[PDB]
DNA sequence: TATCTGGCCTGTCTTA
DNA sequence: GGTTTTTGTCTGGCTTCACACTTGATTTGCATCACTGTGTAAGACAGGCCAGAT
DNA sequence: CACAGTGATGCAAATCAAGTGTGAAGCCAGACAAAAACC
């Protein structure tokens, strides 16, 4: 649990809170960079490469079949097994929230360059309104997939939303979303245990069930340390979902999630509280039936993240986790640290 | 004892000296004026002053015989704090100052003024939309709202780096019209037409937004806001009547790049160059600007209610900012015009002839498909086919010209072409960087000598006006040897003068049809001389204005009547009263700063408040 | 003030005119005429010594629609006249003891908005 | 051979 | 002292004016708050480095 | 221990406006005499 700086290149300006990492094969890709894309980089996904202490972030391109989706902020991201990765929601430059799906592929790997395939999936049914914020993860039961989404928050409805508060923000009803890739089709599900809504919480899916942790809830405006677990049955017939509470929660939101090894995850960042940041970091061990949080040691931070108020980051994949801190101004405008496991 | 001076005696002692001259005044009122000893003796003496040159004595003295009493009413107190740009801790020095030496309240005291000032900011005036306006709250007393517009700043969310005040649109225009008021009616009056005619009215506005660099940041507690501001702000243009199958000009702004109506709308602590934050500020303002499109606003004046139909034209921007907010490419591309699908090398080699096809409503569809990528296209495919809308534009703009920016790129240009005809350029292919700098040095110096020009290191509007005239040219000739390029420049300049007064006039029709006439044959000689004798320069390159300036010119004159009307130079002038206002007439305190000068620009672009300056000039 | 010998002689005079001719309203200008040709050695004396009695005693000195209180007080106004400051006490004193005065506003309010225009 | 002053360079310190 | 001019007194009644209280509502005066700008370039001195001098 | 602002706030202090009759202050009238400055 090794805490370093790092240091960037000449397009450090990119990188800003709710951007996206995405690993394919050991190698890390960057997305959702601050502002639209240049032609610099038209399609805004760079290859994230840290050698040695240093960041040089440089420009992947798309394949000919591609979309080319904005740069979204806070979308809901997940890893699909061959190996591709979900996009769901988020802010685009222009503050819009996009309700489409994104699903990017490595297309070519030629000389160690890598194209990336971009195709939009259209989706039918209960479509989730578009969100940021929110958690999208893939389950696995009886040899078949399903997709759960759950949470977030969005703008006001075009019945009660006005310009004069045309920015208000409210939590998405909270809702479990199945969403079947291989169909574009999308189930919802109402659920006593899941009475108020949730946003940026962090999401463990093993097997069949998927964890919430943390987040913030709104209207109640408190970070609830709570834990509940949601099981996706797939039957022939209509899958069924059903959820437990499960004491011994943690409270934080917008933490980032690593995965150590198979099984065991590690929990660090967030906040506790709005002015309180969460220096400590849990440990998670997955039964196949049971979960287990444990408080390990605490890194050894230092006086910038100690006092800073703000804190971002993202997983990089192989345990190791991209931090960044708002720094001086005249200078940069962030400072990022990496943390290993 | 000396008789001492007769204003030193006590009453009992003046009575004594002129009892004399006193009975003798009794006799002439009784003989000549029926007895009225205080007439004759208050006409002697207003006579006796006028006499001696002292008229503002008589003048008074007649004022209190009569007695009229003196005192300003608080609107035309507002007037003068408002407009001499007192600020009301000075002006209250002022009040305070004339009220214990002439023991007369003259002024009024602060209260009534920053009352009188609620009758000229918005949401005084009740209204009503038909059809209501979708997405607007139809409350009618809404003033300064909160420019976030309940953006999140919880610590989960994006960080918020600015302040942000501003006035609801629509409150904003009826507060316009509330202020045009008489100006209104006595345009209605002059062109013969009924005071009390309330047909469907139209208003044009001229929408304006500019970014500002070198706004300090206040110390004390608040968000740590970057040291750039933004400003939309709007000018009321013309106003038009359907008065059978005509439209009569009831009001035309007559110094439409004053910052006297360059209204402000929305103040903001932000930096333009960061998307995120601009449209997250500015999408309120546009959606409420989108709405009202569609509706007609019924509004009372003068007792009779009347309707007012709005067209909103965005031209008070400068290339950057409008390439920003049209999805557009950055102003180096390939792309170089706004208003055409062109390239830096086709403008080039064909200069002059191109129509304006782009529109905010193509730039919409041609970033879709930029993003969708329909014909499964490599990028560079993909950008040749949607002509650079690689981003979704978020500010509907009208296709035009900023005749200030452009007035200064061509004069850069023209700088730099003076620079290089000094060192023969036309002749000499290669020259290092200290060959160049001493062309520049030469050029500098000149300029001073016979124009009265220091150096700047940014091109100026004045600079500009004063660099492109003929006799600027004879200083600059003075320092190339050969004479068959004093002719050039000659030429060059003589076409360039024959064209600038198309794109600045406000109406080239009546101020320039010479010019206006012959723009096509005129611009057509500039871009041969460019490319014949200039070859050096603008062999497959031109700049982006030289473009804008040579092949659009007559189309947005006979589309809008007038370029020159619609450019930013009045907003930028507002920006000198936004540094003035933010020191001298708001609290210096980062939570206060951005609403106190948004409120005190509005009044300082009020016309009700202006008209009591020219009442000497009745 | 301070009465020189002369002026004490013309008091004494007219409180004599006063005690022979009570009915009678004595003219100013005759008067001082009359007076000064007595004035103008014996007699004066007495006055002579009272003026300088007069000087010891000058040292010893030395050292808009009314408010509907307005418009109910005046309506009352008669009857305490049957019955200025202390008019208004007994006006204020019966206006405190006093719905009673929801009438009085009503007019006030009407009134107001004219004031105002 | 075996040193050796002088400019030269950069970089900090002191006041603005 | 003789002489010159400011300030009076003597009286009845002329006018104009401020005052007399109370009540509720405006209109003025004033202190309060946290922050503003004007302070905003160049020389002294040390220590390393290497070529041409001793 | 720099210092004169920068505008909105909100609470104290002043002001208003009505009823009428008190006393107080200045004034007029002719004639003459205190004081207070100059040859
Ligand atoms: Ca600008
Ligand atoms: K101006
Ligand atoms: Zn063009």
């Known amino acids: ?209 998927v964890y919430i942790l943390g987040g913030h809830s709104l209207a109640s405006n408190i970070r609830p340390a709570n834990l509940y677990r949601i099981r996706v049955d797939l039957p022939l017939g209509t899958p069924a979902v059903n959820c437990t509470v499960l004491p011994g929660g943690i409270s934080v939101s917008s933490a980032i999630l690593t995965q150590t090894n198979n099984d065991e995850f590690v929990i660090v960042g967030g906040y506790q509280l709005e002015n309180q940041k969460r220096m400590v970091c849990s440990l998670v061990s997955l039964g196949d039936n049971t979960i287990e949080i444990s408080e390990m040691e605490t890194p050894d931070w230092t006086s910038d993240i100690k006092h800073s108020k703000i804190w971002f980051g993202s997983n990089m994949g192989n345990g190791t986790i991209f931090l960044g801190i708002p720094g001086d101004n005249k200078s940069e405008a962030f400072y990022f640290y990496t943390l290993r496991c | 004892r000396p008789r001492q001076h007769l204003l030193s005696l006590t009453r009992r002692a003046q009575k004594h000296r002129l009892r004399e001259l006193k009975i003798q005044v009794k006799e002439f009122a009784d003989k000549e004026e029926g007895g009225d000893v205080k007439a004759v003796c208050l006409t002697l003496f207003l006579l006796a002053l006028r006499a001696r040159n002292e008229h503002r004595q008589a003048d008074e003295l007649e004022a209190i015989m009569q007695g009229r009493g003196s005192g300003l009413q608080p609107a035309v107190c507002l007037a003068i704090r408002v407009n001499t740009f007192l600020s009301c801790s000075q002006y209250h020095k002022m009040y305070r100052t004339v009220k214990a030496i002439t023991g007369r309240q003259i002024f009024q005291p602060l209260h009534a003024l920053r009352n009188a000032e609620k009758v000229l900011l918005p949401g005084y005036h009740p209204f009503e939309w038909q059809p209501p306006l979708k997405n607007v709250s139809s409350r009618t007393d809404v003033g300064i709202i909160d420019g976030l517009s309940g953006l999140a700043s919880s610590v989960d969310e994006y960080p918020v780096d600015t302040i942000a005040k501003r006035f609801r649109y629509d409150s904003a225009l009826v507060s316009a019209l509330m202020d045009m008021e008489e100006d209104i009616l006595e345009g209605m009056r002059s062109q013969d037409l009924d005071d009390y005619l309330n047909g469907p009215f139209t208003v044009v506005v001229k929408e304006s937004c500019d970014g500002m660099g070198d706004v300090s940041e206040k110390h004390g507690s608040g968000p740590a806001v970057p040291e750039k501001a933004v400003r939309f702000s709007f000018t009321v243009m013309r106003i038009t009547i359907e008065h059978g199958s005509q439209n009569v000009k009831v009001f035309e702004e007559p110094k439409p790049n004053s910052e006297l109506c360059c209204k402000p709308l929305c103040l903001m602590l932000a930096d333009e160059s960061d998307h995120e934050t601009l449209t997250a500020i500015l999408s309120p303002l546009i959606a409420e600007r989108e709405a009202m499109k569609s509706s007609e606003l019924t509004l009372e004046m003068g007792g009779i209610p009347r309707t007012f139909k709005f067209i909103f034209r965005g031209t008070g921007y400068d290339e950057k900012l409008v390439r920003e907010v049209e999805g557009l490419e950055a102003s180096g591309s390939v792309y170089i015009c706004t208003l055409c699908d062109t390239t830096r090398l086709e403008a080039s080699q064909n200069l002059v002839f191109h129509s304006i096809t782009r529109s905010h409503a193509e730039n919409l569809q041609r970033y879709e498909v930029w993003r969708s990528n329909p014909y499964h296209e490599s990028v560079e495919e993909l950008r040749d086919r949607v002509k650079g809308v690689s981003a979704k534009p978020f500010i509907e703009t009208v296709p035009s010209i900023d005749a200030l920016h452009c007035d200064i790129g061509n004069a850069a240009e023209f700088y730099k072409i003076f620079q290089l005809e000094i060192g023969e350029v036309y002749k000499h292919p290669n020259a290092s960087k200290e060959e160049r700098k001493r062309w520049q040095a030469t050029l500098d110096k000149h300029l001073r000598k016979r124009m009265n020009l220091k150096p700047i290191m940014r091109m100026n509007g004045n600079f500009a006006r004063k660099l492109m005239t003929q006799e600027t040219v004879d200083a600059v000739c003075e320092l190339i040897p050969s004479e068959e390029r004093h002719e050039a420049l000659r030429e060059l300049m003589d076409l360039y003068l024959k064209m600038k007064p198309v794109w600045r006039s406000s109406c080239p029709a009546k101020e320039c049809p010479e010019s206006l006439c012959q723009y096509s044959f005129n611009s057509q000689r500039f871009a041969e001389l460019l490319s014949t004798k200039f070859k050096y320069r603008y062999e497959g390159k031109i700049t982006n204005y030289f473009h804008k300036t040579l092949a659009h010119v007559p189309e947005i004159i006979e589309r809008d009547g007038s370029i020159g009307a619609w450019a930013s130079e009045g907003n930028e002038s507002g920006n000198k009263l936004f540094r003035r206002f933010r020191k001298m007439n708001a609290r210096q305190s980062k939570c206060y700063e951005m609403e106190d000068v948004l409120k005190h620009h509005w009044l300082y672009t009020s016309k009700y408040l202006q008209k009591f300056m020219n009442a000497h000039n009745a | 003030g301070k009465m020189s010998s002369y002026a004490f002689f013309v008091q004494t005079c007219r409180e004599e005119h006063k005690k022979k001719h009570p009915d009678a309203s004595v003219n100013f200008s005759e008067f001082s005429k009359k007076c000064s040709e007595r004035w103008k050695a014996k007699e004066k004396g007495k006055f002579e010594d009272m003026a300088k009695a007069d000087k010891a005693r000058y040292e010893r000195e030395m050292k808009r629609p009314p408010s509907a209180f307005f418009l109910f007080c005046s309506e009352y106004r008669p009857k305490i006249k049957g019955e200025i400051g202390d008019v208004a006490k007994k006006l204020g004193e019966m206006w405190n003891n006093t719905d009673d005065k929801q009438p009085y506003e009503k007019k006030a309010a009407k009134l107001k908005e004219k004031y105002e225009k």
């Open chain 1, 1 to 209: 649990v090794s805490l370093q700086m790092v240091t960037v290149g000449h397009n450090i300006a990119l990188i800003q809170p709710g951007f996206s990492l995405m690993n394919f094969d050991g190698q890390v890709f960057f997305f959702g960079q601050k502002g639209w894309p240049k032609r610099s980089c038209p399609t805004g996904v760079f290859h994230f490469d840290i050698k040695q202490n240093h960041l040089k972030l440089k420009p992947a391109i798309f394949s000919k079949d591609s979309c080319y989706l904005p740069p979204l902020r806070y979308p809901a991201t997940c890893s699909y097994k061959k190996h591709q990765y979900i996009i769901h929601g988020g802010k685009t430059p222009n503050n819009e929230l996009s309700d489409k799906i994104y699903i990017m592929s490595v297309a070519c790997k030629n000389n160690k360059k890598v194209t990336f395939r971009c195709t939009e999936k259209d989706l039918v049914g209960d479509v989730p309104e578009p969100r940021y914020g929110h958690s999208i993860d893939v389950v696995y039961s009886r040899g078949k997939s399903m997709g759960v989404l759950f949470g977030g928050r969005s703008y006001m409805p075009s019945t009660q939303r006005t310009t004069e508060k045309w920015n208000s923000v409210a939590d998405c009803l909270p809702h479990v979303f199945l969403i079947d890739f291989e169909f574009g089709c999308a189930t919802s599900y109402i659920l006593p245990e899941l009475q108020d809504g949730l946003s940026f919480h962090v999401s463990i899916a093993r097997n069949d069930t």
